[PDB]
Design a protein. Structure first.
Length: 322
């Protein structure tokens, strides 16, 4: 063992991405380097600091690898915010593929200082509340709701909710404390994060697109990568890129399915409310306003909003059809 790679994230060890991606990734790097690389996993922010501080922990070499949400740093990753727009995503797997290709095309300057192992998204975002069953747009009116990013929080406000921004690792405390009525998140880690018995009302939508997702990165310090010897850099490259994005997305999709099945079957308490095509169209109409406003503001910013939105949408459809 010549080099140690400390990987730091904010999820519990029992989270599916830890059990089914990071542990086998560790196994692969340690086997394929013939023990010359060790990977050490640190869940639950166990090397210190705040979820939003994680990106800089890697970029600045306090740790070697982080897993984080780009939207936790408001304004930092403007081109990545395209993947926060309403009804843009499909599956974790397909949208993660689209995110990685999109980021390799458009986000080279945005990600300078990290080697991206995977640029991906989570599985379909859904609405979770403590008490209020969301059966219509009217039911979310005045609910204190948490989203991952300023653009998802903007959609929540437009839908008539009162968004309160914070990292998801802060939601359990805030719900129990009465700050939040609910949160948007995928189902995949809802059991590992212990939210399932607190937010027991869940709402999902009709049709071939999800309410929202958000862009996530497995990012290694560009200095740690660059400092590896020429025969070990390729062990990382062989366990990096679009195929890793797909793999993370697919693990989330699979964990979502197990979790949704467990609620539908009565094995775990809670209700899944499926909004039909007519009700869903009302949410998509609000969503269209967010898309239009974001493209407009991107133009005054000096970003080509329409071009990034068209390439993101094109890539989602391509990887969904495939
Ligand atoms: C607990 O659900 C999840 C949330 C996120 C995103 C972060 C956020 O919403 O702040 C990613 C994966 C999850 O399993
Ligand atoms: Mg660095």
């Amino acid at each position: 063992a010549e080099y140690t790679l400390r990987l730091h994230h904010f999820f519990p060890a029992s989270a599916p991405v830890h059990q089914e991606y990071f542990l086998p990734w560790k196994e692969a790097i340690e086997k394929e380097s013939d023990g010359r690389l060790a990977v050490e996993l640190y869940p639950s922010m166990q090397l210190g600091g705040t979820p939003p501080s994680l990106y800089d922990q890697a970029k600045d070499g306090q740790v070697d690898i982080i897993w984080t949400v780009l939207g936790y740093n408001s304004g930092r990753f403007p081109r990545a915010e395209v993947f926060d727009l309403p009804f843009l995503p499909t599956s974790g797997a397909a949208t993660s593929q689209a995110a990685h290709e999109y980021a390799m095309t458009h986000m080279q300057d945005e990600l300078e200082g990290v080697y991206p192992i995977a640029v991906h998204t989570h599985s379909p975002g859904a609405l979770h509340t403590k008490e209020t069953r969301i059966e219509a747009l009217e039911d979310i009116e005045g609910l204190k709701m948490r989203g991952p990013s300023r653009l998802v929080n903007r959609y929540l406000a437009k839908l008539g909710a009162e968004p309160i921004g914070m990292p998801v690792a802060q939601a359990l405390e805030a719900l129990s404390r009465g700050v939040l009525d609910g949160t948007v998140i995928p189902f995949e880690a809802i059991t590992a994060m212990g939210l399932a018995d607190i937010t027991t009302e869940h709402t999902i939508f009709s049709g071939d697109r999800a309410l929202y997702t958000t862009m996530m990165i497995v990012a290694m310090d560009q200095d740690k990568y660059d400092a590896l010897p020429e025969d070990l850099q390729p062990i990382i490259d062989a366990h990096a890129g679009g195929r890793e994005a797909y793999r993370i997305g697919q693990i989330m999709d699979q964990a979502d399915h197990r979790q949704i099945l467990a609620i539908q079957s009565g094995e775990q308490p809670g209700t899944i409310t499926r909004l039909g095509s007519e009700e869903t169209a009302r949410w998509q109409a609000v969503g269209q306003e967010v898309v239009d406003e974001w493209i407009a503001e991107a133009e005054e910013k000096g970003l080509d909003g329409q071009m990034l939105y068209d390439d993101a949408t094109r890539l989602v459809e391509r990887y969904t059809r495939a």
